[PDB]
Amino acid sequence: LKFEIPVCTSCGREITPREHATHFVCPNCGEAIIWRCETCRLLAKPYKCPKCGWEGP
Amino acid sequence: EYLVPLDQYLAAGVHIGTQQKTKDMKKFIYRVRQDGLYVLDVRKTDERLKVAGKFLARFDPQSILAVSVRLYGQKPVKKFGEVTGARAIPGRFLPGTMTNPAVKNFFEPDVIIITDPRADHQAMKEAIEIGIPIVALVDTENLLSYVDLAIPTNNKGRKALALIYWILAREILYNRGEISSREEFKIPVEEFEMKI
Amino acid sequence: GDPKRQRKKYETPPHPWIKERLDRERVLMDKYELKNKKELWKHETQLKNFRRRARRLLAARGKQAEIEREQLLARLKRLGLLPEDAVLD
Amino acid sequence: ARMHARKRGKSGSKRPPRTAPPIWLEYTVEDIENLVVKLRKEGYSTAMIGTILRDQYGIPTVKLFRDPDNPNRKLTITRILEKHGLAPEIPEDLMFLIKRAVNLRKHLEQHPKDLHSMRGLQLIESKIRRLVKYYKRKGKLPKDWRYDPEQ
Amino acid sequence: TLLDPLANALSHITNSERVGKREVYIKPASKLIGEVLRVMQKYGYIGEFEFIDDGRAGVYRVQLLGKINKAGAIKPRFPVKARDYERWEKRFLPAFEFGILIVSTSQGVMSHKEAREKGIGGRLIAYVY
Amino acid sequence: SQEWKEYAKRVLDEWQPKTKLGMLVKEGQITDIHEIFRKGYQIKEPEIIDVLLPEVNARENQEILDIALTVRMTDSGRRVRFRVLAAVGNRDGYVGLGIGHGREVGIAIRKAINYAKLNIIEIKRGCGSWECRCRRPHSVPFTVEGKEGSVRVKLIPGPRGLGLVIGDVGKKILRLAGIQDVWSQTLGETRTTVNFAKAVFNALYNTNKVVVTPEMIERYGIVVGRAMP
Amino acid sequence: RNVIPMPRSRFLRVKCIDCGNEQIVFSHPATRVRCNVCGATLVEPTGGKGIIRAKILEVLE
Amino acid sequence: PGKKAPNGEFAGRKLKLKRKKFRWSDIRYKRRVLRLKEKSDPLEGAPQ
RNA sequence: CCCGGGUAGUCCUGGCUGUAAAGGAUGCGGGCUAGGUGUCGGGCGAGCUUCGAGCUCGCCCGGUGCCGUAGGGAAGCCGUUAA
RNA sequence: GAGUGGUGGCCACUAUUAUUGGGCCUAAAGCGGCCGUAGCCGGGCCCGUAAGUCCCUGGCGAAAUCCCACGGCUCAACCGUGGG
Numbered sequence A: 001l002k003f004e005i006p007v008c009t010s011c012g013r014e015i016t017p018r019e020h021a022t023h024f025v026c027p028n029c030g031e032a033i034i035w036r037c038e039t040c041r042l043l044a045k046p047y048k049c050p051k052c053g054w055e056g057p
Numbered sequence B: 001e002y003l004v005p006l007d008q009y010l011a012a013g014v015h016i017g018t019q020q021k022t023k024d025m026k027k028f029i030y031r032v033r034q035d036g037l038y039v040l041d042v043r044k045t046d047e048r049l050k051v052a053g054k055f056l057a058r059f060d061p062q063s064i065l066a067v068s069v070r071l072y073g074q075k076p077v078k079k080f081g082e083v084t085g086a087r088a089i090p091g092r093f094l095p096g097t098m099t100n101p102a103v104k105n106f107f108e109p110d111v112i113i114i115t116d117p118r119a120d121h122q123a124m125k126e127a128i129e130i131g132i133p134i135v136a137l138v139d140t141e142n143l144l145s146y147v148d149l150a151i152p153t154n155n156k157g158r159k160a161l162a163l164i165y166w167i168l169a170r171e172i173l174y175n176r177g178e179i180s181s182r183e184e185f186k187i188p189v190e191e192f193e194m195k196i
Numbered sequence C: 001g002d003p004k005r006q007r008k009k010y011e012t013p014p015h016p017w018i019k020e021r022l023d024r025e026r027v028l029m030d031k032y033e034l035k036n037k038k039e040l041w042k043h044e045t046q047l048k049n050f051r052r053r054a055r056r057l058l059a060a061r062g063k064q065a066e067i068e069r070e071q072l073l074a075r076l077k078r079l080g081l082l083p084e085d086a087v088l089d
Numbered sequence D: 001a002r003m004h005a006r007k008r009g010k011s012g013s014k015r016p017p018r019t020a021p022p023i024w025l026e027y028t029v030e031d032i033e034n035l036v037v038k039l040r041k042e043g044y045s046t047a048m049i050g051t052i053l054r055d056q057y058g059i060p061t062v063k064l065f066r067d068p069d070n071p072n073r074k075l076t077i078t079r080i081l082e083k084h085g086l087a088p089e090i091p092e093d094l095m096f097l098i099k100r101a102v103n104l105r106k107h108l109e110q111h112p113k114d115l116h117s118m119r120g121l122q123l124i125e126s127k128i129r130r131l132v133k134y135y136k137r138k139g140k141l142p143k144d145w146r147y148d149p150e151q
Numbered sequence E: 001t002l003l004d005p006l007a008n009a010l011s012h013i014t015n016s017e018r019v020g021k022r023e024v025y026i027k028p029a030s031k032l033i034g035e036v037l038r039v040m041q042k043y044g045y046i047g048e049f050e051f052i053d054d055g056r057a058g059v060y061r062v063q064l065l066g067k068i069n070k071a072g073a074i075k076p077r078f079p080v081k082a083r084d085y086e087r088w089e090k091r092f093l094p095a096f097e098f099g100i101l102i103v104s105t106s107q108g109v110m111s112h113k114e115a116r117e118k119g120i121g122g123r124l125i126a127y128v129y
Numbered sequence F: 001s002q003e004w005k006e007y008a009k010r011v012l013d014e015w016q017p018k019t020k021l022g023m024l025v026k027e028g029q030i031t032d033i034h035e036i037f038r039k040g041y042q043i044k045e046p047e048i049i050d051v052l053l054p055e056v057n058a059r060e061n062q063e064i065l066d067i068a069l070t071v072r073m074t075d076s077g078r079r080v081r082f083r084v085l086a087a088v089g090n091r092d093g094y095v096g097l098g099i100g101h102g103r104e105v106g107i108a109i110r111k112a113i114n115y116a117k118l119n120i121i122e123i124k125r126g127c128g129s130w131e132c133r134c135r136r137p138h139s140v141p142f143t144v145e146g147k148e149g150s151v152r153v154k155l156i157p158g159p160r161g162l163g164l165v166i167g168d169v170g171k172k173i174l175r176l177a178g179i180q181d182v183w184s185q186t187l188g189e190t191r192t193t194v195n196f197a198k199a200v201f202n203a204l205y206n207t208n209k210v211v212v213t214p215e216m217i218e219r220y221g222i223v224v225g226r227a228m229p
Numbered sequence G: 001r002n003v004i005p006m007p008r009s010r011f012l013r014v015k016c017i018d019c020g021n022e023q024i025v026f027s028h029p030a031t032r033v034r035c036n037v038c039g040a041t042l043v044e045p046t047g048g049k050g051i052i053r054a055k056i057l058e059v060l061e
Numbered sequence H: 001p002g003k004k005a006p007n008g009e010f011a012g013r014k015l016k017l018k019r020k021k022f023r024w025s026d027i028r029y030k031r032r033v034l035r036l037k038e039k040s041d042p043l044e045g046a047p048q
Numbered sequence I: 001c002c003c004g005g006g007u008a009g010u011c012c013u014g015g016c017u018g019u020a021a022a023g024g025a026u027g028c029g030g031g032c033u034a035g036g037u038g039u040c041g042g043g044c045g046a047g048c049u050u051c052g053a054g055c056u057c058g059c060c061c062g063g064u065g066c067c068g069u070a071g072g073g074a075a076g077c078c079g080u081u082a083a
Numbered sequence J: 001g002a003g004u005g006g007u008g009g010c011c012a013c014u015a016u017u018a019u020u021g022g023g024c025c026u027a028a029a030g031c032g033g034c035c036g037u038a039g040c041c042g043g044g045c046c047c048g049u050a051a052g053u054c055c056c057u058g059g060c061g062a063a064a065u066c067c068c069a070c071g072g073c074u075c076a077a078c079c080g081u082g083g084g
């Protein structure tokens, strides 16, 4: 079997091999993993947790 | 309700902004006074402080780094590191601390706390390149670029920084289970602030 | 206009002195004991023509295309270059 | 942009989207026609009549009432005037431009060296020719009608 | 002055998607733009869209999903026969079935795949991939 | 392949990691090459690639693209410096490019090889030509573009068995990445080897920036990383 | 949002001080507005919003 | 400089005229069509 | 080249000539694509006021400058006044 | 390799003629500035027409030359029967 490519939480695009992305557990609930791509981090796009609904950088 | 009474917040001067503003900071701005100075909303600060306190408690205690170039923030970060066991770097940030393995004090954290994105530009620039989450205190003047968790506050005053770091340390201790209640934390706020 | 002129049936290399090509062709010439390079080149051209017919028919459709496709397959496997159950690819 | 000066002014009216006249409007169609005829007999221009109606009688544009005679089109000031024979013979904007050009020409007779004002005259006459071509195409002017300053 | 409402819409969409916008407003609406949007939505390039009525020609509101690499108009609108779609595909598209060409035919506006299925030609007006 | 297994085993034990990722590799928490990409890690120790992709040390998986000598002028004469441009790969799905400088050729070559490993990337392969639809990872899956300096490079899918229709620098770089057939178009000054190589490298890297759907993966036979037979 | 343009002016119902008559006027007049009965001035035109000299009763939609 | 012109569908004549006009700036084309070499060649077009 | 003098010209009226590093070395019209901060004209809101066609702050439109994100370029650099 | 070199010409090289597909701040190159005739390019909706445009089908565009399979000269070049 193969491996799955991570996907940005905000824009839904895939993460390239050497970009300045990041990933961390949801601050409010701690149950989901948030991924942010380089463009979304640069432009300060808001993100929303899929489990608890808490949102925003 | 609130971690501390709103009177204490207002006395510490947390709500006081600057003469400038930014488009992405307007989600936290409350109103603008007649002299052209902007004011922050204190309730958002309290909510974000609680969320950040929950967030930082899940990491390994000694993998947290806090930095401050400004003079008024050097004592609070040092005390915060002493209480919670996290590493603290006050004063000048040596370039290459996080990117040059040959340096004597090379160190790679898991999360970083920025007192002021404008003043600590070198630390933020190095933290971007290693892909770790970034927590920062933002004023009405700063931008939210490359910030993963923002805490709206006045990040230039003495009492304001002291109070913010005291609250954050207490919240971390409470969430990680080292104290059974909020009131058990018997350390005066004045011990966090620089004298004279 | 001009009347018909008979043309060569093989193609010469684009550049006469490329080390890798020289080595490969020397190996082939020594192994199969050919007389001169042009003889070898002749066979190469044949191969190319086959490939060029397969490339054109993959991206085609219609009635004549099917006829030419089956004719190509039949001719190729009549020469002994393909098994009996081969496909165009 | 502007036709000649290439500036980019944006000032203008912002008409809200509405189909039926407002409830607080109380005049009927016949009252409006009577008012329009009265104001025209007072000697006002077509553009000025609508301004007076809007400012003083509280009537937004008369293009909110269906034409009683022709149901397929809405009512306008010029059509109202046509129904009673008070419509201008020459389109109003062309008349205004021609009137402006005549006044300027007699100024340039006393001031032959005012070259900066003369360019304005040239631009005005260019506008006049554009308009006369358009109106000839649509049949609002006789095909032999000509604009001559010497008139 | 304004010359081609359709080109402005597609340029606006491709400009907005590169900076991660989530929705756009197409200012002068028309039936042709509506048809193009319907075709684009059928293949999953955009989300839902709606028509908003002002006193003027009307506005279109479109939701974006970040699934567009490029979108553009074709000028002049070349006529194409029912068996000549391959060279235009090579001219505008990156792979042998990557994206769609949008064709106006006497049976409506459709992608070149449907038109090739029906065996009819028309005029090329846009490409999306 | 047996030699490189024991080589990686030999390197692993006598290595003292200095970075976080090196510690993760040393403790066996990360065991495959694909696990170090797409999460923002910094790569600063060459031994990581040696342990995870040992075959890049083979003589047949390395290429010295170019060597040049440059001059700095001083009142006591000319100071000469060497610039070496090199590339490495595993001929399956990974490739890296690097530049090294030194006072003599050997030092420059060693440094250039070292920097190539730290710049390793993984690509996508497939078959997207109009006149060859075989679902096998022998070419680029779709047209891609890259640029550097004045050089622009466009790569176009080609039929199986065609060969590499591109200049020699592109030939070597594409061969080290595991691609057999391609068509190409260029603009600008290709005689500047550094810019040509960087443009080809960027064109290969850009295959990760094209949005795709699950159907396209099946239609073009897209493969990421190793082919995995 | 603000895609549809909306005017910033209003229509007002006012009452004449002298005559006592009630009229409906525009808040941004380009002429002098006078009472339809007594003829007294109601609104004075300016560069932008006019100056109202009568008594305001209601701000219409 | 704006977009290259003309681009219209019914502008064939102008496009052809433009291309013909600027081809005379090419020295190779100009010498061939006007046969300038033949007019000054002492060998009169012979190879020997 | 520096110093003491000096004709045409430089100034006004009526014509002719149509040339400049006449340079923003950047043809003109339209749609779209982060922000920050000065200044000129108009309008709107709020607060002061010696009641001034006055002062301060915020927002909208149009001009006129600087710093700068994505993108562009051989680079110098340009970057909603686009290259 | 029974051939292999020299001189002149055309195409490619060349995106150095650019529809596909080039350029014009500092490298060749934006008229000193503006107004406007022919030409080219032109806002939204409804009804009609069917010139352009698309599909189907009759009559044509000689043979030779080009591509494919089969057949005759030992195979081939060449020639014949069919399909394009």
Ligand SMILES: [Mg+2]
Pocket: C001
């Ligand atoms: Mg003849």
Ligand SMILES: [Mg+2]
Pocket: F075
């Ligand atoms: Mg010296």
Ligand SMILES: [Mg+2]
Pocket: F148, F149
């Ligand atoms: Mg560059």
Ligand SMILES: [Mg+2]
Pocket: I022
């Ligand atoms: Mg001058």
Ligand SMILES: [Mg+2]
Pocket: none
């Ligand atoms: Mg401005």
Ligand SMILES: [Mg+2]
Pocket: I068, I079
């Ligand atoms: Mg700038």
Ligand SMILES: [Mg+2]
Pocket: J013
């Ligand atoms: Mg040549």
Ligand SMILES: [Mg+2]
Pocket: J022, J023
């Ligand atoms: Mg050129």
Ligand SMILES: [Mg+2]
Pocket: none
């Ligand atoms: Mg000029």
Ligand SMILES: [Mg+2]
Pocket: none
């Ligand atoms: Mg000039």
Ligand SMILES: [Mg+2]
Pocket: J043
């Ligand atoms: Mg139209």
Ligand SMILES: [Mg+2]
Pocket: J050, J051
């Ligand atoms: Mg017809």
Ligand SMILES: [Mg+2]
Pocket: J063
């Ligand atoms: Mg014939």
Ligand SMILES: [Mg+2]
Pocket: none
């Ligand atoms: Mg025989």
Ligand SMILES: [Mg+2]
Pocket: none
């Ligand atoms: Mg035979």
Ligand SMILES: [Mg+2]
Pocket: J079
């Ligand atoms: Mg024959």
